Write a protein that binds this ligand. Structure first.
Ligand SMILES: Nc1c(C(=O)O)ncn1[C@@H]1O[C@H](COP(=O)(O)O)[C@@H](O)[C@H]1O
Ligand SMILES: Nc1c(C(=O)O)ncn1[C@@H]1O[C@H](COP(=O)(O)O)[C@@H](O)[C@H]1O
Lengths: 212, 212
C-alpha cells in the first residue's frame, strides 16, 4: 500500500520510501526500516474500538420478547452489545423515564429500539424525552399491522422517532448509526454489502443453468 | 301525583290521604294539611345537585383549541363545569401526570377528555394512570383520520379508554356518566331525547306536505 500520515506524500511510511532512493546506502536502509517500524507500532490499533456502542430494546410486554431476541441476536452480528428491558409508556410512564435516564447517564452512546404492539406510545414518549436516537420496531402481524403502524409514523412536531419494521433491519439501522463513529461496525456493514452481492451473483450463476 | 315515602302506601303524602277519609273531620283535615306541608318542606330540594361533576379536556397542542371549545360549550348545555388544559404525553409526560393528580386529588368526580391528533398517546397514558374515566375525542379530519383513529382504539390490556369522535358527543357521553349520580344532568339528557324526537315529528310533518 501507500500510507501518507496527514495525507502528506513527503511523510510516506510505506515501501515507496525504498523504491524512491536514487542510491541504496546503509543510511537509506535505516530510514526505510524506521518507516516499516512506524507502521508496525500502529497497525495493532486498527483492531481497537475508538467508541462504545449500545442498543437498548424497550418492550411494553414480555409477549413481544421473541421479536426483541431477534433484534438482540442481529446486534451481536455487528459486535454491538444489546440490552432488553420491560417498560410500558401507558401503565408505567414514570418507570419508562427512570430507565431511559439510567442509559442516558452513564456516558455510553445509545440507540433505543421501542417495541410496542397496537398503539405504540413507547417510541413517541421515548423520542420526546431523549436526545439519543429512537427507532420504533413494532411487532406488526397481518391481522392489524396496516392499522397499528400509523401510531409509529404520524407523530406530533418535535419528534425525530424513525420506523423500521424488520427486527434484523432495526439492528442494521442501529449499526449504520454507530458505523459513523466506529470503524469496526462500519467494516462489518461494508463487508456485508459485498457478501450479499456475492450471494446474488452465486444464486444467479446457479439458476442460469436451468436456462440451458 | 301519588308520593310514597320508602315506596310505602300507608305513608302516602299526596291528596289520596284526603280522597280516602271515610268522613272529613277537622282532625282528618289537620293530618291532610301535615302531608301537604311534608311535601312542601322537601320539594325545593329537587332543585339541589346531590353530586359535583367536572369534565377536564386535556389537549396536546393549542392548534386543537377550537375542537376543545366545542366540548366545553356542549358541557355547559348539561350544566357541567369544563376545564381546558394543555399537556403533551410525548413532550411533557411528567407534567401530564402532575395535572392529572391535581384533578384526582381535590375530591370532585371527574371525566377526562383526551384531545390529541395524529398518534394519540395522551388518552392511553391518562387511561393507564387514573381510576376515573377517560374518553379520547381525537380531532380527526378526512386527510389522515382513517389512519389516526386506530391509535385511540387498539390499546394494550388494562386500559379502559373509550373513543367518541363527535366533540358534542364526548360531552354528551360525559353527561350520561354523571347522570348516573346526578338527577339534574340525567333530566337534561331525558328532556333532550324528547325534544329531538319532537323535532323529527315536526320535520316529518313539514316534508309530508310536499307529498300532496
Ligand atoms: N403499545 C404498547 C404500550 C405502550 O405504548 O405503553 N404498552 C404495551 N403496548 C403493546 O400492546 C400489546 C399488548 O400488550 P399487553 O396487553 O400485555 O400490555 C403489546 O404488543 C405491547 O408491546
Ligand atoms: N398526539 C399528540 C400528543 C401526544 O400524544 O402526546 N401531543 C400532541 N399530539 C397531537 O399531534 C398534533 C400535532 O401537534 P403539535 O405538533 O403542535 O404538538 C395535534 O393535533 C396534537 O394534539
Amino acid at each position: 500500500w501507500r500510507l501518507w500520515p496527514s495525507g502528506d506524500r513527503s511523510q510516506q511510511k510505506d515501501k515507496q520510501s525504498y523504491r524512491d532512493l536514487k542510491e541504496v546506502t546503509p543510511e537509506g536502509l535505516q530510514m526505510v526500516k524506521k518507516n516499516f517500524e512506524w507502521v508496525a507500532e500502529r497497525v495493532e490499533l486498527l483492531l481497537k474500538s475508538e467508541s462504545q456502542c449500545r442498543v437498548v430494546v424497550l418492550m411494553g410486554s414480555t409477549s413481544d420478547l421473541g421479536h426483541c431476541e431477534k433484534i438482540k441476536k442481529a446486534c451481536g452480528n455487528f459486535g454491538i452489545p444489546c440490552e432488553l428491558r420491560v417498560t410500558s409508556a401507558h401503565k408505567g410512564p414514570d418507570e419508562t423515564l427512570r430507565i431511559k435516564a439510567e442509559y442516558e447517564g452513564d456516558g455510553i452512546p445509545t440507540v433505543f429500539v421501542a417495541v410496542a404492539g397496537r398503539s405504540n406510545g413507547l417510541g413517541p414518549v421515548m423520542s420526546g424525552n431523549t436526545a439519543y436516537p429512537v427507532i420504533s420496531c413494532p411487532p406488526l402481524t397481518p391481522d392489524w399491522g396496516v392499522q397499528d403502524v400509523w401510531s409509529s409514523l404520524r407523530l406530533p412536531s418535535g419528534l425525530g422517532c424513525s420506523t423500521v419494521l424488520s427486527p434484523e433491519g432495526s439492528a442494521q439501522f442501529a449499526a449504520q448509526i454507530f458505523g459513523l463513529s466506529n470503524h469496526l461496525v462500519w467494516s462489518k456493514l461494508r463487508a456485508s454489502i459485498l457478501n450479499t452481492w456475492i450471494s446474488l451473483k452465486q444464486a444467479d450463476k446457479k439458476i442460469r443453468e436451468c436456462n440451458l
